[PDB]
Design a protein around this ligand. Structure first.
Ligand SMILES: O=c1[nH]cnc2c(-n3cc(CCN4CCC(Cc5ccc(Cl)cc5)CC4)cn3)nccc12
Ligand SMILES: [Zn+2]
Ligand SMILES: [Zn+2]
Length: 339
């Protein structure tokens, strides 16, 4: 389903929520994947940590200062690595007069203030922090241990590990797909909202074509230059060039799911914390095999997946004759139980 490819929101009951791989198959069966991004609001009784007041001494080893260059909706983000700091040190900076969220009536106002000021007063993003804020006993939707078919990488051979994102106002993530065109889970533990922009995978190539036209020097240097996660394109720029996209705001205690080859970027409203990781379903294997990778980085040997799930195609794929065409609208084989 999902004909217009719009971002869908789900409210699973505690029973539906219990199985992660089953629910993903469920949301795929409802066409959630067509948007490239879906929101999952978990049961009201469900909590992964009783309190976030015990993490002030937690170390952010490589905070990055985000320097943005550009104009006319077109930007490049340069990351400057800064010395290690604590969550206590970070929160103090985030909430300071120099870095705090401006006063705003509505989101459209905050969005406009972001697109107008992202080049000034560079913020610090306490991104890519190895760790989890989930309590060990928490079995439902545990980012640390999702136990998807992706775990085969580690089982046989940090993509499968959790990462925390301590954000402040204006810190942002550039347009990108997941490494190896994998899926992603992103839980916002606490704090101020996280706004998201998404392009449906079926229009993924249009955005690429548009970026290739805007940064031809970057495109001549690298086939998959968007993977560098440095390109920022404003919603107005996308609308001007007729690129279909959708937007959504993630609030604390909500989950966002990025689907294979579903381009996304966004920004933080203020001081917050988000944990994320990559995962996979049987549908991903074909995206993993066909993924255009950074030539100038995260690379996964597909051989193990093709052995187990496509042994009949192993010889044809190892010969370079696997001419399989991907249908971005087809749900995962695991969704059969719902069709
Ligand atoms: O809100 C967001 N903020 C920031 N980023 C976001 C985001 N993505 C962030 C990543 C990077 C993930 N990860 C990559 C690898 C890196 C360590 C590394 C490197 C090489 C090798 Cl070979 C082994 C390990 C650590 C980091 C991918 N998507 N998606 C959605 C939302 C957000
Ligand atoms: Zn991502
Ligand atoms: Zn590259």
């Amino acid at each position: 389903l999902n004909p217009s490819a719009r971002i869908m929101t789900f409210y699973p009951t505690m029973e539906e929520f219990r199985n992660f791989s089953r629910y993903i198959a469920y949301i795929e069966s409802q066409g959630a994947h067509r948007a490239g991004l879906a929101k999952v609001v978990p049961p009201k009784e469900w909590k992964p940590r009783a309190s976030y007041d015990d993490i002030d001494d937690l170390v952010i080893p490589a905070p990055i200062q985000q320097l943005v260059t550009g104009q006319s909706g077109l930007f490049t983000q340069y990351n400057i690595q800064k010395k290690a700091m604590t969550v206590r040190e970070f929160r103090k900076i985030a909430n300071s007069d120099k870095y705090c969220t401006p006063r705003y009536s509505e989101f459209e106002e905050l969005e406009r203030k972001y697109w107008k000021n992202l080049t000034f007063n560079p913020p610090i993003y306490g991104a890519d922090v190895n760790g989890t804020l989930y309590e060990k006993h928490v079995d439902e939707w545990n980012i640390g241990r999702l136990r998807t078919i992706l775990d085969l990488v580690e089982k046989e051979s940090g993509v499968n590990t959790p990462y925390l994102y301590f954000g402040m106002w204006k810190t942002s993530f550039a347009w990108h797909t997941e490494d190896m065109d994998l899926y992603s889970i992103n839980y916002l533990h606490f704090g101020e909202p996280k706004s998201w922009y998404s392009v449906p995978p079926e229009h993924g190539k249009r955005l690429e074509r548009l970026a290739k036209g805007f940064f031809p020097g970057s495109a001549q240097s690298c086939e998959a230059f968007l993977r560098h996660k440095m390109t920022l394109i404003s919603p107005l720029m996308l609308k001007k060039y007729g690129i279909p996209f959708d937007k959504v705001t993630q609030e604390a205690g909500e989950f966002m799911i990025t689907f294979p080859y579903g381009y996304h970027a966004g920004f933080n409203h203020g001081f917050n914390c988000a944990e994320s990781t990559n995962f996979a379903t049987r549908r991903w294997i074909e995206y993993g095999k066909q993924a255009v990778l950074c030539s100038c980085m995260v690379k996964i040997s597909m051989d193990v997946f093709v052995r187990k799930f496509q042994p009949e195609r192993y010889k044809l794929w190892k010969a370079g004759k696997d001419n399989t065409v991907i249908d971005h609208t087809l749900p995962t084989p695991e969704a059969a139980e719902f069709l």
